[PDB]
Structures are given as C-alpha cells and as structure tokens.
Subunit: 202 residues, 5 copies
C-alpha cells in the first residue's frame, strides 16, 4: 500500500461518529498536557490564559493496515477519524486550536493527536506572586462517555517546551486520574486532573 | 445491534427539522441550569457573564431501538437529531458552547443534551455587593413552538466553582406560560432566579 | 399531511435562491423592530449597541399546503426558505443573531421570521442625557432588490418587551416607509426608517 | 425564462473556481470604494477602522441569457459565482462583510457585487486633526491574478453616502490605477490606490 | 486544455489528504516570511502582533498538465490541494489569514501559496526601545510530518514593510533547524526567522 491507498481506505470507511470499543471494553484514552505558555493571570478573578500541547492517544483497530512494504504512519484530518469528546470541566472559553487539525495514525491503529490549544480556566491563582507559587488544577475528560465507554489516563521535563519568555515559570506539573459520579446518574466519568504549580518570575 | 448500526440508523433516518410530537401532544422538554461560574458582573449596566450546564431532556420515539443484546445508550452529534429551539429571552450575547456538541440517546428514545454555555444576560445585578445579594432571572423557552408543540418544565449550585469571586445563595425555578395580545397561542419558558453575591 | 411530509415537501421544492414574485409584482415585506435593550451609547462617536426583535413577514405561495387534517403552521430553518436580503444601511457591525434561525410558515404560504439581533449603528446620539432624549434613526431595506422586486412597509407598546434593567428608557418609536436612489442606478430601494427616541434614566 | 429558470441554470452550471477569461484577454474588474464611516483612528499607530461599500463589476459571459420575455437582472448568492480574489494590501484585519452576500447578474453577464465592509488599515493618519487633514491610501488588487488575467480600473459626490454622524468628514477621495512587479514574481499585478483625505470635525 | 478543464482535473484528482512524496524522499517545502507590519509589542509580556506574507512553495507532480496550447498557471482554492501542515511553534493566536485562500499551480506541478497572516507570538521583545532593538525568533515547520516526509528550507528585508508602523526592521535572518522531542525518535525541520526590530526614535 502507498499513502494514497491508506488515506483513501480511511476516508471511505471512516465512521467518525462511532467510538471504536473492542469486545465491550472502554476505549483507553491517554492525555498529557505539555505547558507552552502562561499568558494572562488574574489573582482577583482566579482566571488564567494558558497554551498547552494536549498529547492524546488511543487505539482504533478499524484504521489498521498491513505495514509490510507500506508506510508505518500517515497524517489524517481529524474530520475523517473518531476523536474522544474531551472537554476541560473548568474552561471559561472555547479551546482555540492553534495547529493544523491532523492526527498521526500508526499501521496498528494507534492514533496520536496533539493540538496546541490556548484556553482560559477558572482555577486557584492565589500565591502566584510568592515563592511556593499558585496551583491551578485543570480537569479534562469525556463529556458524554462514562468509564465503561472511555477510560482517561495520564501518560519528560515539565518545562521542556515551556516558553523562556513567559512572565511565569513552572515549579511542578502533576497529572492524576480522577472520576466524577454526578447526583442524577449511576455512571462515573473519568478525567485527568493536571495540577500546574507556577509563579511570577522575580 | 452494535453502536455502529444504531448510529448508522439514526444518521440515515434523522429528520432533525421534524419536532417529534406524539398523537398531537406537545414535546415535553425539561430544562435545568447547573451554574458553574459567574465571571463578570456590572451593577452599572445590569449585565452578567455566566457559565452553566444546560441539562435538556425530551423523548424522540423515532430514535428508539430494541436494547436486548444492544447498548442502552449512544453518543450522537446534535446535527443528526431534532433539538428544541430554546433561547434565553434576556441573553445579550450568542451562547458560547464550551463542550462537544453531542447528546446521549437512550434505547427508549430519551435524549439528554447538556452543553456547557458561557453567555451574557441583562438582569438585576443590584445588591450584588450586599449580604442578601443580587437576584438575576434568566428565562429560557422555545423561540418558535407554542405550548401545543413544546412544553418546558424545570426538572443546581452543587458544581459551582469554589474559585469564582461570587457565591450562590439560592436558585429557584418556575414555569411561565404567556399569551401575547397579537396571537392566540401560549409560549412556555422556565424562569431561573440566581441569587448570588460577591464573596 | 403531517409535519414530516410538509417539511419534506418544503425542503425538496423551496428554491431559497428564488424571490417568490407573483405576476411580476414586488414581494410585499413587512418589517417592525421591537427594541429589547440599549447596551452601549457614545455621544462623542454617535454609535449605539442595540438588541431588537426584527418582526419580518411576507408570502411565498410555493410553500402553501392544504391544511384540512394537517398542521396550520410549521417551524422551518431559514436555510430551507427564500428570505428577504434585508440590511440596516447605517449598521457598523454585522447583525449578531441571538436566536435559533427558524421561521414560522402558515399553510397559506405566509412566513413569519423574527430573529433577536444585537447590532451597532451610526446615528444621532445627541441629547441622550437630556429630558427630550436622542432620536437614533435606523434604515432597513433590501440590499439587492429595488421597489419593483421588494416593497417594505412597517406593520403594540414600544417598550412592551424593552428591558427594565437597561441604563436607558424609550420615549417613542416611529416606523415609516422611505425610498433611497443611489447616484449610479435609476431604481429606488424601499426601506423602513425606525426613529428610536430614548434617553439615559440617570 | 423566469427567475426560477435563470437561477437554476446559474446554480447548475456555476464554475465559481473558473476565471471567465475570453480568448486569453484579462477579465476587466472595476472597483470603487464608497466611504460610509470612519469609526476609529489612531495617529500613534497609523491605523484606521473604516466602513465602505466596495462597488465591484466585471463580465462573466457564461452567466448571460436571452432577456426577451425574461427578467433583465437577478440576485445571485456569490457562492454560485466566480468573484475576483481582491485583497487590500495594507489591511490589518479580515474584511467584515456587513451585508447579504448577493450580487446582481444582468442578462448580458455583467455582475455587480457591492458588499458593505468594515476593515482596519495601516495608512498615514498624520494631520487628521488639521485643516488639510490626513491622506489614508488603500491599495486593492487581485491576490493571485496578474495583469494578463485580471485588470483593475476605478469606475468611470465622495461624501454622498458618508454618515453625517461620523466624528470625521471627507475632504477628497481620488482613485488611481497602478501596475506593479513584485520581487517574488515576473508578472505585473494591477491595483486601484484609493486616497481618502479626511479630518476630525 | 483551457482553465476550466485544468481546474476540473485538479478538483477531481488532487488528493488534498495525500502528501505528494516522490520515491520515498521528503517533500521539499520552501518558506520565507516577508514582514509587512509590527502592530502591537509588549516588552512586559514578551508578545508581538505581526503581519507577514508567508511565501510557501513545493512541487506536487499529481497536479501537472501538458502546457502546449494551455495556460502555464492557474489559481486553485487550497481546499482542492495538498498544502503542508505548517505551524508557528511559538504562536499564541490562530493565524488570521487576511487574503483569498488561493494558491498558484504551474503546469509542472509547482505550487506557490502566499497568504497574508496576522498572528501573535511569544518571543524576546527585550531591547525594542533601544538602538540595537529586539530579536524576536519565530519557528515554522510541519506539525505532523518529520524530516523523512517534509523538509523545510528558507529561500535565500523591509521591501514590503509598512512605512507607517511605529517599528522598523534592522535585520531578518531565516535559517534551517531540526528539533527532536524527548518522547519520539524523529526530527521535525523548521525555519527559524530572527526579526531584529525597534521602535522608531
Ligand atoms: O451529564 C453530565 C452531568 C453533570 C452534572 C449533572 Cl447534575 C448531571 C449530568 C455528566 C457527564 N458529563 C457531562 C455532564
Ligand atoms: Cl501521510
Ligand atoms: Cl456511543
Ligand atoms: Cl414544526
Ligand atoms: Cl432575483
Ligand atoms: Cl486561473
């Protein structure tokens, strides 16, 4: 197969509306935030404007092809793929996607989608101008798929991609798995809670 | 049936333009606002910027499937479904939808659509910096469907951000049904009274 | 007929690009503005930011159906209908439509379209902080259809739907029929001139 | 023919991607800006926010019909027509189109497209608060079509449509045709340079 | 062939989803920024708002046609072409494209795409109000295609820069880099554009 054939096959048989569950197990989605910038912070309103790369991976076996005498990977527009319906629970703006909306598909059906996103959050900005800094928690999970359909799991240097030119610096990033069960319903919705410990540079 | 078959069937036979009335009874739409944040308040202009989850439920029997050896529920893009034409009467900005535009469809044809919306409203901000607080009333109803086509009923502060400059004292919901001088028909709305104050 | 059949028939046959002229007479469009709010006024720049319901009615006989044992009216997306190409001649922002873009179609082919619009205008803001108030004139008519193709005519209490919470109050609204000729072309374009007499409550 | 037939024919045979050149001669595009308002001016940054009607005309013979016992003109969505790829070279915002995106098509294939546009420009705001005023020059031409494919010409009262309520007033509007060879490409690109001489009241 | 036939053929066969690699060599993409304006600078936040023409060229042999008794070039909507998935690594706003989204396709399959973009960047604004000025570095490369799939090269400063900017350009250098990230084995090529500029005195 060449790239043309693989991309034709994916475009022609793409069920972007269909979660690729295998044998009634959840789709395992990995999410890791790489912080790139902290642009605007307001300690009065507890609001932050952040840029991050959202490293997102999952398997869709319907995409897989025999890689013998074929490309190992192709770039696919996300409009031709099922993508997890991830939302930031404490976002106060729509995600501004700064990058081309393409994912990488490996011949085994692994998908890697890593958009650069600028987004505003409601989180704890208290202590931002102190030595110990602020801890801003960002929660990202499936909007409509509970734990039997989508599982979310966290997956380098926290500041490896962070802009040296930000007014802020990163002290620590932790990414941990949470679940919310709401009063209305019995099902749990999984999220990654990303704790961004940062401060204003002196 | 698997998810692929159910979602194919819905996509292929979706009449998103067709209100799913049964036996000439109105479609019963439930609306409950879960307040998440109060972001900007202006007591001079009487304007508020609010984030809420708009819990919206109704039945569309045309979506229903036999759930024996099948999923009980699927996630469906709202572009493939009829959705009530709800509007906030006192909104002064278009709703900014912060979440994926998917609904949950249950095998009995129940639809649950719960977008996170940021929107600006014209309401009473007077008293926001006092102990008793402000009461901001938000009215939501069908823009074009009268009471014989759509009924709206209330089904709320539990998921409010601890980091807001504001706090919720109380949320009350009433149903209103208004017949205007021009027309014979009644228009239903849910009136949500948000009593909040600066911390 | 049921709603499903009527909406199918309209979607299949509507011709949204085709002005429904009868025997080469103009399409009679009625326009009435119901003011809902006055949000921002600037007496220096002579600019106002207003919210209004634009009550718009006309007949399209191609939409009509036999109402015996059928609904008298349906809700139709405006993308499935011909709609008059109305513009505010003194608008300085695009109309922000706040409401679902649906019209009501009666079985005789009468259409009622009433969007809630927020829009900014260039008009006379002088006297806004006085007892007599400002008179801000808004002109609305067809962008491309002259008087032989579209006629515009004005169609309750002026303040009936006006927000009690506005910094402003309405003293009077008058709506009258005008015509504009541009220097380039011989034809007249009909408009409704809406005079909004309002003042600061102070 | 009635309007329904003409609009069906245009919609069914519309090649909006295809420049309607005749025998490898350029498409003659006429462009005239009618200024409606000057909303924000900044003499520090040399930026202006303007509203104008962009009167745009050209011929597309593929649209033409026999007008005997037929309408002489129809309103057509620009999504069903080829439109010149005009750009303002010194625009610093996207054109905000305020009006329905319809053009007039005459039975001979003449197209008239006149959107109301709000747009921000980088131009000379110096002297805006003086008697002689500022001269803000706006250059509009085809982004991708050189002079053998598109020619641009100014059309053959400057304040006739200008808002009486603007903080500003128009002293003069002049339009001149330029034909410029840029470093990237060997071909010449035509533009209309519109000089807006205006001042604060 | 006429333009209508060429544009039909391209629309029917272009494969916009398919990188036009030849014999498993990378697609050679050339990128050069022509700075048009510097609109807003903030030395406190280290943010700049810039307008530039992004001159972008590559070959797609699947677009080629016999140019004998045919146009040498056509204007094609980029939605009908494969375009490199270029991103500015230090952009903090989405690119605001100010120009019609058309590329030029030559009969040999060479593509020229040159949008005017307004975009905000995180870069070194320190020294902007001094004689030596600030040096703001902008890195542009393929978001998803590593060096075996896409190579990025500069073509070899103030020619199109607005005389009305509050700022002036002292120097522009454009040089080729390769970045390997810790997670993954492949290198991604980028053009690093160093914009040395200052406030006019
Ligand atoms: O459906 C969700 C929900 C949240 C809160 C309440 Cl009170 C009810 C339902 C849970 C899944 N994510 C979207 C919202
Ligand atoms: Cl690829
Ligand atoms: Cl599902
Ligand atoms: Cl209906
Ligand atoms: Cl017409
Ligand atoms: Cl061409």
């Amino acid at each position: 197969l060449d790239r043309a054939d693989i991309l034709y096959n994916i475009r022609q048989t793409s069920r972007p509306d269909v979660i690729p569950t295998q044998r009634d197990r959840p789709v395992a989605v990995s999410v890791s935030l790489k912080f790139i910038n902290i642009l605007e912070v307001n300690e009065i309103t507890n609001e932050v404007d952040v840029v991050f790369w959202q490293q997102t991976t999952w398997s869709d076996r319907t995409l897989a092809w025999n890689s013998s005498h074929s490309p190992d990977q192709v770039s696919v527009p996300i409009s031709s793929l099922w993508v997890p319906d991830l939302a930031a629970y404490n976002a106060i703006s729509k995600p501004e996607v700064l990058t081309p909306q393409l994912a990488r598909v490996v011949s085994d059906g692994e998908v890697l989608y890593m958009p650069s996103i600028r987004q505003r959050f409601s989180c704890d900005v208290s202590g931002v101008d102190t030595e110990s800094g602020a801890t801003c928690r960002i929660k990202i999970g499936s909007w409509t798929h509970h734990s039997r359909e989508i599982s979310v799991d966290p997956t380098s240097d926290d500041s490896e991609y962070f802009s040296q030119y930000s007014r802020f610096e990163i002290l620590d990033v932790t990414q941990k798995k949470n679940s919310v069960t709401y009063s209305c319903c019995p099902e749990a919705y999984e999220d990654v809670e990303v704790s961004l410990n940062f401060r204003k540079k002196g």
